[PDB]
Write an enzyme that holds these catalytic residues in place. Structure first.
Site, PDB file in Angstrom:
ATOM      1  N   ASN A 107      -5.603 -11.253  -1.173  1.00 33.81           N
ATOM      2  CA  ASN A 107      -4.202 -10.895  -1.290  1.00 33.81           C
ATOM      3  C   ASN A 107      -3.522 -11.617  -2.441  1.00 33.81           C
ATOM      4  O   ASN A 107      -2.605 -11.006  -2.992  1.00 33.81           O
ATOM      5  CB  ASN A 107      -3.449 -11.206   0.006  1.00 33.81           C
ATOM      6  CG  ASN A 107      -3.852 -10.337   1.174  1.00 33.81           C
ATOM      7  OD1 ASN A 107      -4.669  -9.429   1.055  1.00 33.81           O
ATOM      8  ND2 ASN A 107      -3.304 -10.571   2.361  1.00 33.81           N
ATOM      9  N   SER A 138       4.109  -6.259  -0.075  1.00 34.06           N
ATOM     10  CA  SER A 138       4.398  -6.152   1.336  1.00 34.06           C
ATOM     11  C   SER A 138       5.810  -6.658   1.616  1.00 34.06           C
ATOM     12  O   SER A 138       6.183  -7.718   1.111  1.00 34.06           O
ATOM     13  CB  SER A 138       3.445  -6.989   2.211  1.00 34.06           C
ATOM     14  OG  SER A 138       3.864  -6.928   3.559  1.00 34.06           O
ATOM     15  N   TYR A 151      -1.256 -14.077   6.164  1.00 32.05           N
ATOM     16  CA  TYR A 151      -1.060 -12.792   5.534  1.00 32.05           C
ATOM     17  C   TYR A 151       0.301 -12.707   4.851  1.00 32.05           C
ATOM     18  O   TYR A 151       0.322 -12.384   3.658  1.00 32.05           O
ATOM     19  CB  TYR A 151      -1.180 -11.681   6.585  1.00 32.05           C
ATOM     20  CG  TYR A 151      -0.887 -10.338   5.957  1.00 32.05           C
ATOM     21  CD1 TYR A 151      -1.847  -9.695   5.186  1.00 32.05           C
ATOM     22  CD2 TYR A 151       0.347  -9.734   6.135  1.00 32.05           C
ATOM     23  CE1 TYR A 151      -1.573  -8.464   4.605  1.00 32.05           C
ATOM     24  CE2 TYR A 151       0.606  -8.509   5.563  1.00 32.05           C
ATOM     25  CZ  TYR A 151      -0.354  -7.884   4.803  1.00 32.05           C
ATOM     26  OH  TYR A 151      -0.057  -6.667   4.233  1.00 32.05           O
ATOM     27  N   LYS A 155       1.418 -12.624   0.776  1.00 37.56           N
ATOM     28  CA  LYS A 155       2.268 -11.612   0.169  1.00 37.56           C
ATOM     29  C   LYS A 155       3.524 -12.198  -0.445  1.00 37.56           C
ATOM     30  O   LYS A 155       4.006 -11.741  -1.489  1.00 37.56           O
ATOM     31  CB  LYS A 155       2.603 -10.518   1.193  1.00 37.56           C
ATOM     32  CG  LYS A 155       1.395  -9.747   1.709  1.00 37.56           C
ATOM     33  CD  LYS A 155       0.665  -9.082   0.557  1.00 37.56           C
ATOM     34  CE  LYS A 155      -0.194  -7.902   1.035  1.00 37.56           C
ATOM     35  NZ  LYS A 155      -0.886  -7.314  -0.155  1.00 37.56           N
TER      36      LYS A 155
HETATM   37  N1  LIG Z   1      -0.347  -0.944   5.939  1.00 37.44           N
HETATM   38  C1  LIG Z   1       0.771  -1.668   5.895  1.00 37.44           C
HETATM   39  O1  LIG Z   1       1.607  -1.708   6.801  1.00 37.44           O
HETATM   40  C2  LIG Z   1       0.985  -2.502   4.595  1.00 37.44           C
HETATM   41  C3  LIG Z   1       2.307  -3.004   4.571  1.00 37.44           C
HETATM   42  C4  LIG Z   1       2.574  -3.772   3.438  1.00 37.44           C
HETATM   43  C5  LIG Z   1       1.730  -4.056   2.411  1.00 37.44           C
HETATM   44  N2  LIG Z   1       0.425  -3.523   2.547  1.00 37.44           N
HETATM   45  C6  LIG Z   1      -0.526  -3.777   1.469  1.00 37.44           C
HETATM   46  O2  LIG Z   1      -0.874  -2.486   0.976  1.00 37.44           O
HETATM   47  C7  LIG Z   1      -2.226  -2.535   0.425  1.00 37.44           C
HETATM   48  C8  LIG Z   1      -3.124  -1.616   1.208  1.00 37.44           C
HETATM   49  O3  LIG Z   1      -2.796  -1.714   2.612  1.00 37.44           O
HETATM   50  P1  LIG Z   1      -3.407  -0.547   3.536  1.00 37.44           P
HETATM   51  O4  LIG Z   1      -2.556  -0.136   4.659  1.00 37.44           O
HETATM   52  O5  LIG Z   1      -3.816   0.640   2.733  1.00 37.44           O
HETATM   53  O6  LIG Z   1      -4.732  -1.274   4.068  1.00 37.44           O
HETATM   54  P2  LIG Z   1      -6.215  -0.710   4.134  1.00 37.44           P
HETATM   55  O7  LIG Z   1      -7.048  -1.366   5.172  1.00 37.44           O
HETATM   56  O8  LIG Z   1      -6.224   0.767   4.365  1.00 37.44           O
HETATM   57  O9  LIG Z   1      -6.824  -0.981   2.696  1.00 37.44           O
HETATM   58  C9  LIG Z   1      -6.358  -1.856   1.641  1.00 37.44           C
HETATM   59  C10 LIG Z   1      -7.293  -1.746   0.444  1.00 37.44           C
HETATM   60  O10 LIG Z   1      -7.722  -3.086   0.057  1.00 37.44           O
HETATM   61  C11 LIG Z   1      -9.022  -2.976  -0.474  1.00 37.44           C
HETATM   62  N3  LIG Z   1      -9.693  -4.274  -0.496  1.00 37.44           N
HETATM   63  C12 LIG Z   1      -9.805  -5.207   0.493  1.00 37.44           C
HETATM   64  N4  LIG Z   1     -10.503  -6.284   0.126  1.00 37.44           N
HETATM   65  C13 LIG Z   1     -10.856  -6.023  -1.177  1.00 37.44           C
HETATM   66  C14 LIG Z   1     -11.593  -6.770  -2.117  1.00 37.44           C
HETATM   67  N5  LIG Z   1     -12.120  -7.966  -1.855  1.00 37.44           N
HETATM   68  N6  LIG Z   1     -11.771  -6.208  -3.343  1.00 37.44           N
HETATM   69  C15 LIG Z   1     -11.222  -4.978  -3.593  1.00 37.44           C
HETATM   70  N7  LIG Z   1     -10.532  -4.206  -2.799  1.00 37.44           N
HETATM   71  C16 LIG Z   1     -10.375  -4.789  -1.586  1.00 37.44           C
HETATM   72  C17 LIG Z   1      -9.710  -1.928   0.406  1.00 37.44           C
HETATM   73  O11 LIG Z   1     -10.818  -1.296  -0.231  1.00 37.44           O
HETATM   74  C18 LIG Z   1      -8.569  -0.919   0.620  1.00 37.44           C
HETATM   75  O12 LIG Z   1      -8.743   0.064  -0.406  1.00 37.44           O
HETATM   76  C19 LIG Z   1      -2.656  -4.020   0.540  1.00 37.44           C
HETATM   77  O13 LIG Z   1      -2.259  -4.628  -0.677  1.00 37.44           O
HETATM   78  C20 LIG Z   1      -1.871  -4.394   1.794  1.00 37.44           C
HETATM   79  O14 LIG Z   1      -1.951  -5.720   2.237  1.00 37.44           O
HETATM   80  C21 LIG Z   1       0.068  -2.761   3.611  1.00 37.44           C
END
Ligand SMILES: NC(=O)c1ccc[n+]([C@@H]2O[C@H](COP(=O)([O-])OP(=O)(O)OC[C@H]3O[C@@H](n4cnc5c(N)ncnc54)[C@H](O)[C@@H]3O)[C@@H](O)[C@H]2O)c1
Ligand SMILES: NC(=O)c1ccc[n+]([C@@H]2O[C@H](COP(=O)([O-])OP(=O)(O)OC[C@H]3O[C@@H](n4cnc5c(N)ncnc54)[C@H](O)[C@@H]3O)[C@@H](O)[C@H]2O)c1
Lengths: 254, 254
Positions: A107, A138, A151, A155
């Site tokens: 992250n 986030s 987490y 962020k």
């Molecule tokens: N889902 C939510 O509520 C939410 C809210 C706020 C922020 N986010 C952020 O949004 C982004 C995606 O979240 P999401 O819901 O799609 O989660 P998700 O589980 O669907 O996937 C997040 C992505 O991170 C990639 N990833 C993880 N570890 C990695 C690594 N070591 N190298 C390369 N890629 C890697 C995965 O391949 C995936 O494509 C992230 O940055 C996450 O923390 C998500």
């Protein structure tokens, strides 16, 4: 910013929020859409290729926990092929506060390291053309989900980092803004581990309040890219898009 | 909170801000003052012993970049000897944005891991007594010095992390507040590296504005400890002490 014939790199394009953002980006008639992700998703890749075959979609395996040198190596190869890259989107994220180090490495550190790598090619001080960086952070980086404090802290780090990049734009030529989704129905938040299990039901409790779908988030994501505001802090929450104002609690004066 | 006969652990007590805070803490008639720092400073230790020989001052070698298990081992031994620890102060910090990983490991991950380690002994859910955590963060965690964006982002992480701990106090029994010095005349800020050398004169430019001494910072530090406000975000800038209010940009509702 008009995305037509742009060259875009999207780190972690094939995850919940990513894929839905990627479906919208490929409708924009990109020249090149380069997907960097740790794991192949042939289904998702096949889908995205279907949506707009005018776009050249490339996939490279990429773990954001590799050292900068590694990222530099991979980016060299992409820049070599494409020549210019307009936009870098840093989307990698893990939610799992049983994984303290891995959370922070993916992250926060990983985002910082990809950005540092791409500045080799972009920095106007080395004669580079400059560039645009879109950081997926986030809303938890504004205000934590305190049952996943690690987490949220990671962020908060990338929100800060992104704000500082945008202030460095006059020196580096690289503009930057963060995309900060609220709770979105992806698999990431379906179930997850709270720190020290202070709240084992944290996923069930989060999805008892208003969420947004990945698609509405996807749509707003591309709108924020097209607005192309250096320094913007985009909140994408509950199907909406808004720029938040950062509180100035202290000023360095430089 | 009356510090008399308290048992305090201070991580990185012997550094610029640390030592001056330690001088004030030992005047408070602590039972036990346990200093964990990477490197011995015999001079500083001798000084502190001189100031109040009623206090039992102990030094253990401690690198915050060790794994939790390591921190747990060390804390076990300390808790064994002392039986009870009242207060943990996490003060380790490096300013050096040429050291991206090290910055994050020390300033963010290390803080998080020491905290996680001590919760084994403190967590009320495991029958522990609860405890108080004082995290030294930084005003750069509110608003970056953007020429040292990694440093600032790491401090933004620990501000966030500390806020979340304080919200978890009803579950864990552990209260927590951050201590956030403004620019202070220590060696840390005397000279330091900006990220990608965007500003090689960052130290000289910072010390062209109002700073505070270590001593005034030290004094205010102990005041904040004695106020003992779970959740407080203490700004210690320009010789003063004040609690800042965190903007609620978003709420998880849980
Ligand atoms: N889902 C939510 O509520 C939410 C809210 C706020 C922020 N986010 C952020 O949004 C982004 C995606 O979240 P999401 O819901 O799609 O989660 P998700 O589980 O669907 O996937 C997040 C992505 O991170 C990639 N990833 C993880 N570890 C990695 C690594 N070591 N190298 C390369 N890629 C890697 C995965 O391949 C995936 O494509 C992230 O940055 C996450 O923390 C998500
Ligand atoms: N000096 C300032 O202007 C300032 C302002 C705000 C916040 N801070 C923060 O205050 C704390 C100390 O700052 P300072 O000015 O006194 O710095 P300093 O250079 O004088 O020393 C900081 C302390 O960090 C310790 N440390 C570094 N790496 C460590 C590791 N791996 N394990 C254990 N301890 C380690 C050092 O040994 C020292 O005790 C840090 O968190 C720092 O970032 C400093």
């Amino acid at each position: 910013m008009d995305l037509t014939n742009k060259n875009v790199i999207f780190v972690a394009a094939l995850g919940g929020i990513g894929l839905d953002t990627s479906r919208e980006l490929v409708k924009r008639n990109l020249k090149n859409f380069v997907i960097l992700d740790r794991v192949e998703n042939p289904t998702a890749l096949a889908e995205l290729k279907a949506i707009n075959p005018k776009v050249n979609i490339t996939f490279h395996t990429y773990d954001v926990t590799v050292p900068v040198a590694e990222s530099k190596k991979l980016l060299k190869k992409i820049f070599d092929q494409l020549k210019t890259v307009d936009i870098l989107i840093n989307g990698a994220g893990i939610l799992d506060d049983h994984q303290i180090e891995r959370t922070i490495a993916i992250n926060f550190t990983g985002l910082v390291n990809t950005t540092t790598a791409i500045l080799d090619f972009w920095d106007k001080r080395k004669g580079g053309p400059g560039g645009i960086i879109a950081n997926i952070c986030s809303v938890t980086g504004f205000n934590a989900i305190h049952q996943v404090p690690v987490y949220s802290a990671s962020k908060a780090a990338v929100v800060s980092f992104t704000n500082s990049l945008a202030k460095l734009a006059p020196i580096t030529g690289v503009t930057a803004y963060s995309i900060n989704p609220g709770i979105t129905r992806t698999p990431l938040v379906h179930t997850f581990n709270s720190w020290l299990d202070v709240e084992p039901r944290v996923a069930e409790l989060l999805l008892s309040h208003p969420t947004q779908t990945s698609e509405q988030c996807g749509q707003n994501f591309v709108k924020a890219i097209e607005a192309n505001k250096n320094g913007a802090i985009w909140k994408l929450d509950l199907g909406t898009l808004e720029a938040i104002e950062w509180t100035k609690h202290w000023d360095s004066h430089i």
